[PDB]
């Protein structure tokens, strides 16, 4: 319930793709410091 993370991957024109992740909070006040972890494909 807390977050609303969204992840997308697109091919950029050795494929060299582009990854974009966007997040937002669910509540009423700004959150404190947060941690984000990313693990990529082989």
Swiss-Prot record:
Superkingdom of source: Eukaryota
Protein name, entry field: Complement C3c alpha' chain fragment 2
Organism: Homo sapiens
The encoding gene: C3
Residues of the full protein shown: 1359 to 1409 of 1663
């Amino acid at each position: 319930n807390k977050f609303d993370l969204k992840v997308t991957i697109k091919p950029a024109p050795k494929n060299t793709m582009i990854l974009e992740i966007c997040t937002r909070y669910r509540g009423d006040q700004d959150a404190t410091m947060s941690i984000l972890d990313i693990s990529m494909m082989t």
